[PDB]
Design an enzyme around this catalytic site. Structure first.
Site, PDB file in Angstrom:
ATOM      1  N   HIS A   1       0.834  -1.195   0.000  1.00  0.00           N
ATOM      2  CA  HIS A   1       0.000   0.000   0.000  1.00  0.00           C
ATOM      3  C   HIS A   1       0.870   1.246   0.000  1.00  0.00           C
ATOM      4  O   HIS A   1       2.064   1.207   0.303  1.00  0.00           O
ATOM      5  CB  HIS A   1      -0.971   0.010   1.183  1.00  0.00           C
ATOM      6  CG  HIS A   1      -0.318   0.157   2.515  1.00  0.00           C
ATOM      7  ND1 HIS A   1       0.228  -0.908   3.207  1.00  0.00           N
ATOM      8  CD2 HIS A   1      -0.152   1.241   3.301  1.00  0.00           C
ATOM      9  CE1 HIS A   1       0.704  -0.492   4.363  1.00  0.00           C
ATOM     10  NE2 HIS A   1       0.491   0.816   4.447  1.00  0.00           N
TER      11      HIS A   1
ATOM     12  N   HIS B   1       1.615   4.000   1.672  1.00  0.00           N
ATOM     13  CA  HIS B   1       2.019   4.819   2.801  1.00  0.00           C
ATOM     14  C   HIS B   1       3.523   5.053   2.779  1.00  0.00           C
ATOM     15  O   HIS B   1       4.282   4.300   2.177  1.00  0.00           O
ATOM     16  CB  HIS B   1       1.608   4.164   4.140  1.00  0.00           C
ATOM     17  CG  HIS B   1       0.184   4.458   4.528  1.00  0.00           C
ATOM     18  ND1 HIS B   1      -0.493   3.748   5.507  1.00  0.00           N
ATOM     19  CD2 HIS B   1      -0.678   5.404   4.088  1.00  0.00           C
ATOM     20  CE1 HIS B   1      -1.718   4.253   5.637  1.00  0.00           C
ATOM     21  NE2 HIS B   1      -1.847   5.264   4.800  1.00  0.00           N
TER      22      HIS B   1
ATOM     23  N   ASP C   1       5.926   4.523   4.759  1.00  0.00           N
ATOM     24  CA  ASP C   1       6.859   3.519   5.245  1.00  0.00           C
ATOM     25  C   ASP C   1       6.958   2.295   4.337  1.00  0.00           C
ATOM     26  O   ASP C   1       7.726   1.382   4.655  1.00  0.00           O
ATOM     27  CB  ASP C   1       6.530   3.094   6.695  1.00  0.00           C
ATOM     28  CG  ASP C   1       5.098   2.645   6.900  1.00  0.00           C
ATOM     29  OD1 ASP C   1       4.191   3.109   6.158  1.00  0.00           O
ATOM     30  OD2 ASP C   1       4.852   1.792   7.829  1.00  0.00           O
ATOM     31  N   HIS C   2       6.231   2.264   3.217  1.00  0.00           N
ATOM     32  CA  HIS C   2       6.306   1.146   2.291  1.00  0.00           C
ATOM     33  C   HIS C   2       6.563   1.576   0.858  1.00  0.00           C
ATOM     34  O   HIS C   2       7.227   0.845   0.114  1.00  0.00           O
ATOM     35  CB  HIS C   2       5.025   0.322   2.396  1.00  0.00           C
ATOM     36  CG  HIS C   2       4.737  -0.089   3.793  1.00  0.00           C
ATOM     37  ND1 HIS C   2       5.550  -0.963   4.498  1.00  0.00           N
ATOM     38  CD2 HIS C   2       3.760   0.288   4.648  1.00  0.00           C
ATOM     39  CE1 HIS C   2       5.076  -1.116   5.718  1.00  0.00           C
ATOM     40  NE2 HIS C   2       3.996  -0.357   5.839  1.00  0.00           N
TER      41      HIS C   2
ATOM     42  N   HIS D   1      -6.701  -1.266   5.445  1.00  0.00           N
ATOM     43  CA  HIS D   1      -5.613  -0.430   5.954  1.00  0.00           C
ATOM     44  C   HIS D   1      -5.450   0.823   5.102  1.00  0.00           C
ATOM     45  O   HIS D   1      -5.295   1.936   5.632  1.00  0.00           O
ATOM     46  CB  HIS D   1      -4.318  -1.231   6.026  1.00  0.00           C
ATOM     47  CG  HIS D   1      -3.186  -0.453   6.619  1.00  0.00           C
ATOM     48  ND1 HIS D   1      -3.095  -0.210   7.966  1.00  0.00           N
ATOM     49  CD2 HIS D   1      -2.168   0.222   6.047  1.00  0.00           C
ATOM     50  CE1 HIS D   1      -2.025   0.511   8.225  1.00  0.00           C
ATOM     51  NE2 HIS D   1      -1.463   0.833   7.068  1.00  0.00           N
TER      52      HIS D   1
ATOM     53  N   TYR E   1      -7.447   4.353  13.729  1.00  0.00           N
ATOM     54  CA  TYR E   1      -8.505   4.706  12.792  1.00  0.00           C
ATOM     55  C   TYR E   1      -9.842   4.814  13.511  1.00  0.00           C
ATOM     56  O   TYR E   1     -10.144   4.027  14.415  1.00  0.00           O
ATOM     57  CB  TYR E   1      -8.667   3.649  11.706  1.00  0.00           C
ATOM     58  CG  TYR E   1      -7.536   3.492  10.728  1.00  0.00           C
ATOM     59  CD1 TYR E   1      -6.368   4.221  10.843  1.00  0.00           C
ATOM     60  CD2 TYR E   1      -7.657   2.612   9.666  1.00  0.00           C
ATOM     61  CE1 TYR E   1      -5.351   4.057   9.927  1.00  0.00           C
ATOM     62  CE2 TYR E   1      -6.659   2.468   8.749  1.00  0.00           C
ATOM     63  CZ  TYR E   1      -5.519   3.180   8.891  1.00  0.00           C
ATOM     64  OH  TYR E   1      -4.542   3.014   7.946  1.00  0.00           O
TER      65      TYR E   1
ATOM     66  N   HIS F   1       5.351  -5.130   7.418  1.00  0.00           N
ATOM     67  CA  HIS F   1       6.061  -5.146   8.682  1.00  0.00           C
ATOM     68  C   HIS F   1       6.320  -6.603   9.031  1.00  0.00           C
ATOM     69  O   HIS F   1       5.345  -7.332   9.294  1.00  0.00           O
ATOM     70  CB  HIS F   1       5.250  -4.474   9.763  1.00  0.00           C
ATOM     71  CG  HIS F   1       5.046  -3.032   9.510  1.00  0.00           C
ATOM     72  ND1 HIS F   1       5.981  -2.088   9.870  1.00  0.00           N
ATOM     73  CD2 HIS F   1       4.035  -2.366   8.911  1.00  0.00           C
ATOM     74  CE1 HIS F   1       5.538  -0.892   9.531  1.00  0.00           C
ATOM     75  NE2 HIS F   1       4.372  -1.030   8.931  1.00  0.00           N
TER      76      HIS F   1
END
Ligand SMILES: CO[C@@](NC(=O)Cc1cccs1)(C(=O)O)[C@@H]1N=C(C(=O)O)[C@@H](COC(N)=O)CS1
Ligand SMILES: CO[C@@](NC(=O)Cc1cccs1)(C(=O)O)[C@@H]1N=C(C(=O)O)[C@@H](COC(N)=O)CS1
Ligand SMILES: CO[C@@](NC(=O)Cc1cccs1)(C(=O)O)[C@@H]1N=C(C(=O)O)[C@@H](COC(N)=O)CS1
Ligand SMILES: CO[C@@](NC(=O)Cc1cccs1)(C(=O)O)[C@@H]1N=C(C(=O)O)[C@@H](COC(N)=O)CS1
Ligand SMILES: [Zn+2]
Ligand SMILES: [Zn+2]
Ligand SMILES: [Zn+2]
Ligand SMILES: [Zn+2]
Ligand SMILES: [Zn+2]
Ligand SMILES: [Zn+2]
Ligand SMILES: [Zn+2]
Ligand SMILES: [Zn+2]
Lengths: 265, 265, 265, 265
Positions: free
Chosen positions: D82, D84, D86-87, D158, D189, D223
């Site tokens: 996805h 975001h 951090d990815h 997510h 969320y 993760h």
């Protein structure tokens, strides 16, 4: 009375007439149609394409690349003279079907991204599939592929983002400085007091001087007729080609005539 | 040893210090912070914003617009000096929260669309939320809102798309020609032989002459200190302001010094 | 033999036949052509347009808005059924000529941004000027203008981003729940094992059930004939209109027939 | 009191701790950091990267690719779990520095194109350099590189565009079905009645069932801790890894607990 039907962008048959690859120099080939330029530069590190012509030319271009030994993965870079439908038409499809990324200046990138719509002069009359640029180049910036060095020379006028691309190939043993100079025409344009392009005349004037000064052993143009190439003439396709100086002078004299006719009209 | 953490774009506190609206002319107000310009021009046909400062200034700007009687629906147009995080920072959010559309030149549009990433000099060090331009303007093009006429004057250098915006307001009864001239600084830039900006020096030189010649009864700049405004000084905030000629001269002398230091370094 | 000329997207004359505004409810009007829907919803806080029809309909739409008292500045929002040329055609031009911002789901936004090119089924055969969405909506998300609440109901199939829009107007005194349901046709589509749309059948099936269940006192569709509207029939334009349930059932029976014919072909 | 400074997206040191390539199967390697997954799949026809981790990981990823024998030209495709920070953080830079093109679904493409800004839950708190997708994929669509077949399985929740990617590699002689399943967390969320994501709960529920059913000899997650990988544990990095069923069950029980806590809060 219904609104008019959409009118397709139709062009002279010669613009759509496939031709086999025609060698310009040791690593440079014309692979488009008889009357639209699409230049393939083959390096040991992949291939570069300068223009693609009309939107329906994508498969023909890929056929000619394969004939040259260039697979889709091998096409690395697409460069453009300017982002009108008859020169950038197949770029979106080529990006989908090859490894190619597009480098262009900001003006050409934003016109390409809107598929030639909202043209300063043509409106929505001459559109094509939009494409995104992967790299933005500045005036005088160089791009190097397999050791061939391409230099951008902005020559705004025909479009704001109009660009001449120069590189040095070899011919027999000797270096040949190739200039792929953009169109310098202003077809049906309002030249004076154009609210969408207030500095149009000054930009054309500066662009004539840019073209005059290009490193230019061999001039090529997006419409070969503009530089007196005849791609159907085989071994003497380039025999009558203009110098960059003669191309610039001819374009400026035509431009001056159009200005005078515009004042009278 | 882990890779470094991302470093936030932190700035002097005065750049983030809210101020109440400060009137520049009959329809022109500074509504940003003490040390970042954000100009609101109020017309009977909606409001124009020139710059927004930093990304976290969006709510403050909307508060000051409401204080002026400008609701979100009334903000029609956002114009920019240049598309760095400290001047265009909140544009994306303002477009989401108001009626505002963005007009910018192609260079500023492509830098805005990538949120200031891949900056010619700063890389990804100074980014912000990306936004799309709704209208692309050419050099010298005019945009009219409620009968105030805004003219774009390109002054490339600080960024490729750097722009001065001029318009005529009134003050007491009389016309006042306002020049919102962009930054002319080159902070930490490599000036000579920069491969990402080969004509940087020539563009700065031309931009000094552009600024020198602007219609300029009152000069404003994105960093008020650059034109010797003191937004915290109330009735004499503008008393010490430079002329456009003095601003251009000071920027050129600094630029010449930087060039000499660069040659020595 | 030259490559084929580009073929324009030509349509039945009735699709291009202007009509005067036709009132559907107290604040809802059909303002498109006889055979293409373009809905104007007028609120005290600005106007909403749902679809625009074909690319050449922009000026007619603006004419009909003016007839309704909606100036360009008053158009605030454009919503779409789906992003094909015959429904979203004039969106880019409308955004340039009005205050309107576009809200759409991600699928419709990416197809709109490429002007309908690289269509899952039509390729580049049916393109139009690209436009950018200003707001991305999720399934079931509501948008409120002047107190009319529009709810998005995704009904993927005809395009991935196909959407039904529902809102409640009034008619005489009484509330009327209007459903603007998207096309449920699959014209010439490969339905089974389509590599570009592997879940096409399941999505159509789910979309039939979505349409069946819409709040639906009055059904409208992008092609009025699909819901048995006759915009040329004046006071009984809507007299024969289908219920959402009947529209969904008719579309599912046609879809089942096409599936069987596809298996046989 | 000045407005707050921008706050950088800072993360646990282990997320930024470089590691050497760790082999997962015959052609699949973890080449990210100790606590962020970045998968390299090497084929005779070029390399595929699935995720890149944080924005500052670009050079490390390129270093690890070179260690594997993958030059920049050899990286052909970037896929994402996805979009975001951090990815997908380094995707823009990787596209500039390699041959890589991005394939993603429409939801991930529009979030990537805005650099993670205007996040449904995080707002502008967690942004990164924007990038454009070169190909849009539909649910269940396959992409083939050098004869490794990657299948997209949408698992919205997510993020709207969250995707599991599956492919079959070999290990010793035998086929190994690898599932790179996206995050199933909902960190902070609002789950119920979220106006920006009205069907959030239903989408998570469907995504648990999607993950449960993936072809899944080996599960990996963005993760690694989520699937009980320990990339620092060498030969037994994967020894404790969860099945897809156990990962889905654990995520659903956590989700149910969060729902109950949200109702109480
Ligand atoms: C969009 O493409 C062009 N217009 C048309 O095709 C059709 C036309 C529209 C308006 C006037 S003409 C354009 O850009 O005007 C072609 N390209 C040219 C160049 O210079 O690139 C010119 C070449 O000059 C000749 N007679 O060969 C004119 S034709
Ligand atoms: C991104 O923003 C700027 N850089 C920084 O904030 C921080 C820096 C990065 C590299 C050198 S400094 C920039 O564009 O360099 C600001 N804006 C300016 C303008 O001229 O617009 C200058 C104003 O001059 C002073 N001292 O006030 C420098 S500060
Ligand atoms: C791009 O537009 C459409 N295609 C064409 O115009 C022309 C065609 C191309 C391929 C098959 S037909 C499309 O989307 O297929 C129209 N829109 C429709 C809807 O359902 O939105 C259908 C309406 O059904 C009828 N007969 O009125 C078919 S016509
Ligand atoms: C933007 O990135 C995440 N947020 C943050 O970094 C920081 C946070 C913001 C709000 C709550 S936390 C996110 O998406 O929420 C990370 N990625 C995750 C995934 O599932 O992809 C979760 C992993 O779960 C743990 N504790 O390892 C949470 S951390
Ligand atoms: Zn042209
Ligand atoms: Zn041409
Ligand atoms: Zn700056
Ligand atoms: Zn600045
Ligand atoms: Zn359609
Ligand atoms: Zn249709
Ligand atoms: Zn995440
Ligand atoms: Zn994460």
């Amino acid at each position: 009375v219904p609104l008019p039907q959409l009118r397709a962008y139709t062009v002279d048959a010669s613009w759509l007439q496939p031709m086999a690859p025609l060698q310009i120099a040791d690593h440079t080939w014309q692979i488009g149609t008889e009357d639209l330029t699409a230049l393939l530069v083959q390096t040991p590190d992949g291939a570069v394409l300068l223009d693609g012509g009309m939107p329906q030319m994508a498969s023909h271009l890929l056929d000619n690349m394969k004939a040259r030994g260039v697979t889709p993965r091998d096409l690395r870079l697409i460069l453009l003279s300017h982002a009108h439908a008859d020169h950038a038409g197949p770029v979106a499809e080529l990006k989908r079907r090859t490894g190619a990324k597009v480098a262009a200046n900001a003006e050409s990138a934003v016109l390409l991204a809107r598929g030639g719509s909202d043209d300063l002069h043509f409106g929505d009359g001459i559109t094509y599939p939009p494409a995104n640029a992967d790299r933005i180049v500045m005036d005088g910036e160089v791009i190097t592929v397999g050791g061939i060095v391409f230099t951008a020379h902005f020559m705004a006028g025909h479009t704001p983002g109009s660009t001449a691309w120069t590189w040095t190939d070899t011919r027999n043993g000797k270096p040949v400085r190739i200039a792929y100079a953009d169109s310098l025409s202003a077809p049906g344009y309002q030249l004076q007091g154009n609210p969408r392009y207030p500095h149009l005349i000054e930009d054309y004037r500066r662009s004539f001087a840019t073209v005059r000064a290009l490193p230019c052993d061999v001039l090529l143009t997006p419409h070969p007729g503009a530089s007196n190439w005849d791609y159907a003439a085989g071994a003497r396709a380039g025999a009558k080609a203009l110098t960059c100086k003669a191309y610039a002078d001819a374009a400026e004299q035509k431009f001056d005539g159009q200005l005078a006719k515009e004042t009278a009209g």
